[PDB]
RNA sequence: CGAUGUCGGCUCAUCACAUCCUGGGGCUGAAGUAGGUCCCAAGGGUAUGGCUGUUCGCCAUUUAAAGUGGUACGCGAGCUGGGUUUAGAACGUCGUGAGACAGUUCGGUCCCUAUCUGCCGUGGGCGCUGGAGAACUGAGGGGGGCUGCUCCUAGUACGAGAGGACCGGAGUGGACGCAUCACUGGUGUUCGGGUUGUCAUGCCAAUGGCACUGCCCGGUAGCUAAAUGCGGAAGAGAUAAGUGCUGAAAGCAUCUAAGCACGAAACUUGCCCCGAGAUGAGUUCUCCCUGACCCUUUAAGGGUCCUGAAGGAACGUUGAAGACGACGACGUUGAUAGGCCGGGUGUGUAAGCGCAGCGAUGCGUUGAGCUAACCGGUACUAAUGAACCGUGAGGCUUAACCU
RNA sequence: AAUUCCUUGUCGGGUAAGUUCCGACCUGCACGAAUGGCGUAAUGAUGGCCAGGCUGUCUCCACCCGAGACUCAGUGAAAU
RNA sequence: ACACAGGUGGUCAGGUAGAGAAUACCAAGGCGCUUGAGAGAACUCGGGUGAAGGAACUAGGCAAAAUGGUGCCGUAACUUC
RNA sequence: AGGACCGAACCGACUAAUGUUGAAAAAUUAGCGGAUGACUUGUGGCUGGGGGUGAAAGGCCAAUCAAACCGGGAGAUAGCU
């Protein structure tokens, strides 16, 4: 269970080397309204690929 | 002889006149089109690259398109290589492939085995579970001892423990060839070949026979 | 797929009789003891399943002498030669395991287009 | 069939309930029930039978609830587990008359006498 | 293991899953557009669409079967009267899933599942 | 001794050879069969139960055999607690007694979320020298290496008989490992039906909730063994014990000294799998990128604009792939999931109506109606075109080839 | 024998096989009469044994359902 | 120590089935237990179902599995009746 | 009538499993034993540490017991760490 010696700040950073967040790196632009949206998601003003799909 | 690539299309029974109920695996061994032959000068090994099936050519990459364009532009689902001992083959494709498997009596079938997940010790190896009821605090299917105290002080490299099983190449040898049907490009082999239905298969003449 | 089971349709026997579960049928099975081949009759109450293609079967139970013998028969097997329906049984289930295990249990015969 | 298995006796000289103490043939053979020979104790016996309680001798399994599988895929299942009693040294049938069904799997060597005496094969 | 197996458990027992999809089908029939989580909408397709396929043919047996699989007579009336003729020409695909963003309390993939010929 | 858990069992092993079986030999007081003893040989294999806490031991029954030791008399951050090793009680004995016993008996709390090494699986980063997409060579590494029974040869050789062949063939099994789900089965809370108690949907009828899936009876896909397939080889090389040929030192002799030949389940290959991070970073095939400016501390290098290619990644539908990554299919030039259509299957003649009856119920419509993950089809729904990354011809030394 | 060291005493039983059990023998290391001796119907969450039934205890595990474990968002310790 | 699975004296006691204050379902009333979303590996926990054999398990039938109600018959050794 | 029987409330605690940095400084879940008595329970009171009380265990006397807890002698003493 326990450690026999204290792990180092180096080994802490090496373990958190693969713990990093991933950027979006692209945002699709809807044709009818210029707002950028997550690809295959609603534009947050109510548009999908080319049409108004929800009122809210 | 040179092997061929087919796609597994299922398991059935064949009923002889005596009634022996041979379990047949039908393989769709379609016509195999050569894409490359390797001479001894250019490469150390003498072999044929073969392709089978169809690929749409929307998904064909231009490196693969140029490789297909040499030796006749026909895209297949993949390229597989069979080493030849003696027999010389052209870069064009053969018209019918199962005609060479007509004469052979026993075959070896290679396939990706079905994926069994992170299998346990009891499934992955044939470990024997400890007793269910008399005591046994929380140790029913767990691996027991893995090593032998201070003097080794380590567990060996070949230790039988839990891991991924399946998704691996396995060859089954000496399978009887029940029937060769040229028109449907069908090869009926006795017994059970590896893989799921629709997976790729490597059929070779028997090294044992 | 369609490339399979066309072979099954090649091998399926076309002379198969139609019987509901419960019917007391007789199956004539070839037996090749030596060069000589002879038909053997097995008669009993059917506990069968619907036709799964080439892979079809019937279970038949007879009390030979004190022993309940159950034989599963492959339908489209060449050893199964002739099945005669004989008595017809009216019962309310496909699988008659509970009804056959009881001693002295006799199913009724009903002829009302069933 | 297995060890600690009670069986009925087909033949007359063998008497009533018998138990399989050992599955002969094989180093660690666990289950044997078609034409195999098993070492037998007599757990309960009628006095008309020649053998008596507590006596060890061989037998051959003739009926199994698990059942044989025929080559075409047919399964003949016999209700009840049955044995024909055999001498230890000779492996020959003690009983003069065999009772009940027998299978064609018992057609080899000394079991020819068993299928000859038994009515339904 | 899960090979060729349909059905999403969604961390609930079978009775809760059946009750939840009955209520969700009732809400989707009633409002014609609902916001759910995305796997919930995806299995909601599988419960809701055979109801309209049954509701294409109007008979007492089919209304009784729809009442068995909903237990809401208003929903049965809507399936056999208002919808049904509307989706009669449509050969399946009465449901359309539009993925929204993510829920606030839990980062859950959110979706709007709607009827295709929505009046709004 | 500011702590190194104690027998046995269970699970899981690994090594040695002072070898139990299987292989090769020598000697035999080895006629055959079967043995004894010794040498070489570690590749594989090497029981189930009764009694008792037992290692042991005694026994019953297997088998080719049920090896001997090491590994903290292997293995308690793996398990057990019968054993000992506590506190209760009793008996026998000793002591006046408290109490004691290398006596007995009944009862009597066994904790850990794994940092490091180590393994078992599976990824990310960079490297391999322009960037890609493939297919492989094989340096190394692992897996696998067991055997019985019957028959032929042949009742032959061997033998007075009784018995009965270490050659050479054929089948058939046991234990083991691998795959598979065609069959036989199991399961199948996601299909059908029966049914008890109650509540609800107004009520009859039909259904639904709850009572372990209420109890059951069956059961599709999938998974699986108890089902079926398959395999451990034959070879080839170098050998161990061993047997030899020719042959001197030693005119004879001698298997060795120069030579020459056989000789094992051991070794190396042959069978399967991994595998170029094989930094010794390999090979082959194909695709793709050939614009300027300024500064400039020159294997040299920076900054700017233009242009971003082959391809990848992201996103989405997903998979008989999966802990997560990873991998595979498809993305409107679309069958990739859901739905729809038809079938298949499974369950067993739905509701409703009519008829017989006093009613329960029966009979007809009716093999009806429902049906799952299955099969064949279908753009009805969701797979939007962007965008992102990736570049613009690739360093210095000895060659033909022509300038 | 809750007592016998030797001892798993000797016999007979029960099982294929019985250091347990049961019943006898007396050779009581080291029983013995209110520190009670011998029996005893009933009673016992008592000690030991033998059967019938029953079953995943077992051969030998297989599938299924839920709660975790895995991933994602929020808060966020421990021994050492 | 806690918005802790524990402890806390009395009182009332609806329907149906039931001997019943057992239990099943419901009244009236009160709640879903202050983290959720997925996926459906090993392994762990609580269950369900198992082919054939059935105590071979084990220190020991530990655990599980079974039997279970009401009515009528019927019931042994021993006995302090 | 019963220190009768079966069995809820009630009182206890026989086996197993989980827990063991727990939900809990002895609980939970399946089974268990008594439940008209030598029962159980509420509210007060009494017995005080070489003392009490004990159907007897070195049990209990505030999660403390071969002699409770609090302060004092007290910086006891410590050939030991």
Swiss-Prot record, chain B:
Question: Where, per the database record, does this protein carry N6-succinyllysine?
Answer: 38
Cross-referenced InterPro entries, in alphabetical order?
Answer: Ribosomal_uL3, Ribosomal_uL3_bac/org-type, Ribosomal_uL3_CS, Transl_B-barrel_sf
Q: What are the protein's UniProt keywords?
A: Methylation, Ribonucleoprotein, Ribosomal protein, RNA-binding, rRNA-binding
Tree of life domain: Bacteria
How is this chain modified after translation? Methylated by PrmB.
Q: Which residues carry this modification: N5-methylglutamine?
A: 150
Q: Name one GO molecular function term.
A: structural constituent of ribosome
Query: Which Gene Ontology terms describe the biological processes this protein takes part in?
Result: cytoplasmic translation; ribosomal large subunit assembly
Please give the Gene3D superfamilies that the UniProt record associates with this protein. 3.30.160.810, Translation factors
Which Pfam families is this protein grouped with?
A: Ribosomal_L3
Q: Which GO terms describe its cellular component?
A: cytoplasm; cytosol; cytosolic large ribosomal subunit
Family, as annotated: Belongs to the universal ribosomal protein uL3 family.
Summary of subunit composition and partner proteins: Part of the 50S ribosomal subunit. Forms a cluster with proteins L14 and L19. In pull-down experiments interacts with CedA.
Functional description taken from the UniProt entry: One of two assembly initiator proteins, it binds directly near the 3'-end of the 23S rRNA, where it nucleates assembly of the 50S subunit.
Name used for this protein in its record: Large ribosomal subunit protein uL3
Organism name: Escherichia coli (strain K12)
């Amino acid at each position: 269970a326990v450690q026999q010696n204290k792990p180092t700040r180096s080994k802490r950073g090496m373990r958190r080397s693969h713990d990093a967040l991933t950027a979006v790196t692209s945002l699709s632009v809807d044709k009818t309204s210029g707002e950028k949206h997550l690809r295959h998601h609603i534009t947050a003003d109510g548009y999908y690929r080319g049409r108004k799909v929800i009122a809210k | 002889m040179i092997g061929l690539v087919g796609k597994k299309v299922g398991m059935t029974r064949i009923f002889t006149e005596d009634g022996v109920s041979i379990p047949v695996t039908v393989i769709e061994v379609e016509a195999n089109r050569v894409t490359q032959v390797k001479d001894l000068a250019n490469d150390g090994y003498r072999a044929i690259q073969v392709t089978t099936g169809a690929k749409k050519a929307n998904r064909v990459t231009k490196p693969e398109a140029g490789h297909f364009a040499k030796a006749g532009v026909e895209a297949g689902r993949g390229l597989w290589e069979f080493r030849l001992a003696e027999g010389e083959e052209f870069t064009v494709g053969q018209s019918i492939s199962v005609e060479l498997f007509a004469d052979v009596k026993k075959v070896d079938v290679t396939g990706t085995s079905k994926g069994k997940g992170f299998a346990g010790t009891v499934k992955r190896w044939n470990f024997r579970t400890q007793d269910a009821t008399h005591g046994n605090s929380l140790s029913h299917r767990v691996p027991g001892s893995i090593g032998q105290n201070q003097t080794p002080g380590k567990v060996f490299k070949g230790k039988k423990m839990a891991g991924q099983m399946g998704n691996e190449r396995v060859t089954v040898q000496s399978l009887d060839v029940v029937r060769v049907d040229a028109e449907r490009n069908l090869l009926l082999v006795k017994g059970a070949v590896p893989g799921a239905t629709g997976s790729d298969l490597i059929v070779k003449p028997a090294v044992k026979a | 797929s369609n490339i399979i089971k066309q072979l099954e349709q090649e091998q399926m026997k076309q002379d198969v009789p139609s019987f509901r579960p419960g019917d007391t049928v007789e199956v004539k099975v070839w037996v090749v003891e030596g060069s000589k081949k002879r038909l053997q009759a097995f008669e009993g109450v059917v506990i069968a399943i619907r036709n799964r293609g080439l892979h079809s079967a019937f279970t038949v139970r007879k009390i030979s002498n004190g022993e309940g013998v159950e034989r599963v028969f492959q339908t489209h097997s060449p050893v199964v030669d002739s099945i005669s329906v004989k008595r017809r049984g009216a019962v309310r289930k496909a699988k008659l395991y509970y009804l056959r295990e009881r001693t002295g249990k006799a199913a009724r015969i009903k002829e009302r287009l069933n | 069939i297995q060890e600690q298995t009670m069986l009925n006796v087909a033949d007359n000289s063998g008497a009533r309930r018998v138990m399989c103490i050992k599955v002969l043939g094989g180093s660690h053979r666990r289950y044997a029930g078609v034409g195999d020979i098993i070492k037998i104790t007599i757990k309960e016996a009628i006095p008309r039978g020649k053998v008596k309680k507590g006596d060890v001798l061989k037998a051959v399994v003739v009926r199994t609830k698990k059942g044989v599988r025929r080559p075409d895929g047919s399964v003949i299942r016999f209700d009840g587990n049955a044995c024909v009693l055999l001498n230890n040294n000779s492996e020959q049938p003690i009983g003069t008359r065999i009772f009940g069904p027998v299978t064609r799997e018992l057609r080899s060597e000394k079991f020819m006498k068993i299928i000859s005496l038994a009515p339904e094969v | 293991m899960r090979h060729r197996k349909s059905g999403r458990q969604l961390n609930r027992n079978s009775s809760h899953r059946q009750a939840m999809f009955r209520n969700m089908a009732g809400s989707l029939v009633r409002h014609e557009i609902i916001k759910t989580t995305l796997p919930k909408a995806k299995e909601l397709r599988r419960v809701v669409e055979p109801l309209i396929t049954l509701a294409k043919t109007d008979s007492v047996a089919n209304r009784r079967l729809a009442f068995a699989r909903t237990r809401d007579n208003e929903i049965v009336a809507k399936l056999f009267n208002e919808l049904g003729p509307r989706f009669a020409s449509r050969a399946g695909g009465y449901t359309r899933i539009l993925k929204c963003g993510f829920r606030a309390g839990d980062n859950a993939p959110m979706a709007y599942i709607e009827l295709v010929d929505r009046s709004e």
